[PDB]
Nucleic acid binder design. Structure first.
Lengths: 107, 109
RNA sequence: UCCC
C-alpha cells in the first residue's frame, strides 16, 4: 500500500495489534525497502508525562480513543505488517514528536 | 547498568531469534533513567548495505567486531536494558556523527 | 472492534 510519514496505522505485532506512528522519511517509505520505522502508540494517557512523549487527541487522529505517542518505543516493521490507515498527525503535533524524537536519540 | 550511547552490544534480536550487533542510539539521560528499554540500530555484516544513504560502514579495526560491518540506520530496535550485557566497544565520535546524519535522514529529523 |  501507500505508506507515508506522519500517518497513523494499525500495525500487526495471534499478533498483538497496535496503532503506530510512521517516523521514517518518505523517500525510504516509497522505496522497495521492506521495512517501516514507527513509534508505538498507546491509549494509556499516563505515558504523556514522560519527557519525549506527545499526546494525540482522538478528534484529530480518528483513533477510537485519546492516545499518546511513545517515542521511547521504536519498532522497525515490514510494510506488509501495516493494516488500516486510520489518520494523519498534523504539522504542529508532528513537530512536537520530532523534538521529543531528538531528545531520546540525542539528535 | 550504565549502557551508554555510541556503544556496541551483542543482542538476540527477535524476528529463531538472531544474535546481531546493535549500536545504542538512545541518549544517555534516558539511558540513566528508570526507563527499562534502550533504542539501538542494528549492525550488519552485509557490507553491501553501506551503499544505502544513511548507513555507515564500520571498519573492523575501530569496532572490535570480528568482521567489517555496517550499521543499518533503517533497522531500529527497542531492547531491554537487561538484554544489553555483551559489550564489544564504542563507535568513535568521527563515525557516530555520520550515524547522526543518517538517522536524521531516515527519520526526517 | 480494536491502556504494570
Amino acid at each position: 500500500m501507500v505508506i507515508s510519514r506522519a500517518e497513523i496505522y494499525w500495525a500487526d505485532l495471534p499478533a498483538k495489534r497496535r496503532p503506530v506512528l510512521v517516523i521514517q522519511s518518505d523517500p525510504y517509505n516509497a522505496s522497495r525497502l521492506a521495512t517501516v520505522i514507527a513509534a508505538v502508540i498507546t491509549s494509556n494517557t499516563a505515558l504523556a508525562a514522560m519527557p519525549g512523549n506527545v499526546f494525540l487527541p482522538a478528534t484529530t487522529t480518528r483513533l477510537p480513543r485519546d492516545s499518546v505517542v511513545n517515542v521511547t518505543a521504536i519498532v522497525t516493521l515490514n510494510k506488509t505488517d501495516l493494516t488500516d490507515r486510520v489518520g494523519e498527525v498534523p504539522a504542529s503535533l508532528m513537530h512536537e514528536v520530532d523534538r521529543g524524537l531528538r531528545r531520546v536519540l540525542d539528535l
